[PDB]
Amino acid sequence: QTGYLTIGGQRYQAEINDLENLGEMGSGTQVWKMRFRKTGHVIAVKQMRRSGNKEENKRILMDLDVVLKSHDCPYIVQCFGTFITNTDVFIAMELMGTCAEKLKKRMQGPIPERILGKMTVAIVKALYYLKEKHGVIHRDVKPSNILLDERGQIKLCDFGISGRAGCAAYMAPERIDPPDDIRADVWSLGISLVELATGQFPYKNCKTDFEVLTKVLQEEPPLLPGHMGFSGDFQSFVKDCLTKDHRKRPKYNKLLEHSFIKRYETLEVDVASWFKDVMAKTE
Numbered sequence: 001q002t003g004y005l006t007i008g009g010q011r012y013q014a015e016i017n018d019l020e021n022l023g024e025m026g027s028g029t030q031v032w033k034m035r036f037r038k039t040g041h042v043i044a045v046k047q048m049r050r051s052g053n054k055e056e057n058k059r060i061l062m063d064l065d066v067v068l069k070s071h072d073c074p075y076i077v078q079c080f081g082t083f084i085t086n087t088d089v090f091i092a093m094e095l096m097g098t099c100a101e102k103l104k105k106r107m108q109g110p111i112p113e114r115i116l117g118k119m120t121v122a123i124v125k126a127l128y129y130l131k132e133k134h135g136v137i138h139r140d141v142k143p144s145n146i147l148l149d150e151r152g153q154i155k156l157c158d159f160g161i162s163g164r165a166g167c168a169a170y171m172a173p174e175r176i177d178p179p180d181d182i183r184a185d186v187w188s189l190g191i192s193l194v195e196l197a198t199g200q201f202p203y204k205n206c207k208t209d210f211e212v213l214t215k216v217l218q219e220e221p222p223l224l225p226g227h228m229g230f231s232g233d234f235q236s237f238v239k240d241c242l243t244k245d246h247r248k249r250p251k252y253n254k255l256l257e258h259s260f261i262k263r264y265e266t267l268e269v270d271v272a273s274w275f276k277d278v279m280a281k282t283e
């Protein structure tokens with residue numbers, strides 16, 4: 001069913017002219033910031049043009065399929081509803097602060113471990129939920145697909161190439177050189193964790209896509225430095241994700257029993273405040 005917006009448990013009959021367009025947002029991968037006139041809620045709306053590129057439209061619809069059946073996962077962005085007009089489909093998603101990539105840009109430096117700990121719990125539980133509940137592999141884990149909001153929430157973004165290929169920079173060794181699969185996302189999570197923890201992308205000074213792949217296979221996994229005060233548990237987690245033999249790489253169920261995960265499940269970390277203060281610094 002479409003033509004309904006449900007926010008916080010309250011469903012409102014709606015059409016797209018009940019929404020005020022407040023402007024484009026930061027994803028070319030079209031999304032608008034819109035305001036529900038009936039309630040004042042500000043939401044994100046994807047506009048899928050009927051006459052659009054069917055390669056991209058297929059991707060919007062696969063992303064929407066897993067989003068829609070994933071409403072009981074608190075670590076995946078939710079869809080408030082849809083509007084199917086004669087010319088367009090509008091997908092109303094919850095509005096969040098930014099992607100972890102832009103956080104790294106605005107921060108101009110490392111993200112603290114206590115924020116990465118809550119993030120690591122969220123993405124792992126999101127990917128584990130996708131595998132067990134829906135048999136879905138993300139295959140494109142990267143900081144641009146990790147979202148954060150004013151209220152300390154961290155959620156998996158949008159997965160339009162999910163299967164029941166990704167960016168070459170975060171691709172696992174066994175996807176570069178498959179000997180002949182769910183552990184390929186664990187590697188990209190580790191590369192993203194090292195990137196956000198150091199403020200640098202691990203494989204540095206790479207000019208072409210193929211050169212990045214070359215250093216993934218030719219060189220040792222990029223682990224966390226020991227002179228930044230990282231906890232032993234954090235380093236143990238990163239080295240476990242960034243294991244090069246995919247058979248010796250842990251599954252999600254073994255990953256969730258890791259001390260790093262177990263600590264930040266029960267440690268109250270104020271992500272909301274840290275997020276608002278970092279977002280305050282202008283450019």
Ligand SMILES: *CCC(=O)Nc1cc(C(=O)NCc2cn(-c3ccccc3C)nn2)cc(-c2n[nH]c3ccccc23)c1
Binds near residue numbers: 093098102147157158
């Ligand atoms: C970088 C990757 C990404 O997905 N980025 C992204 C950015 C934003 C975003 O920048 N939103 C701006 C914004 C402004 N407010 C705001 C402004 C003034 C006063 C009050 C408020 C609340 N809020 N947000 C948003 C998104 C985004 N939001 N929801 C979704 C859902 C699915 C994908 C992306 C997404 C993402």
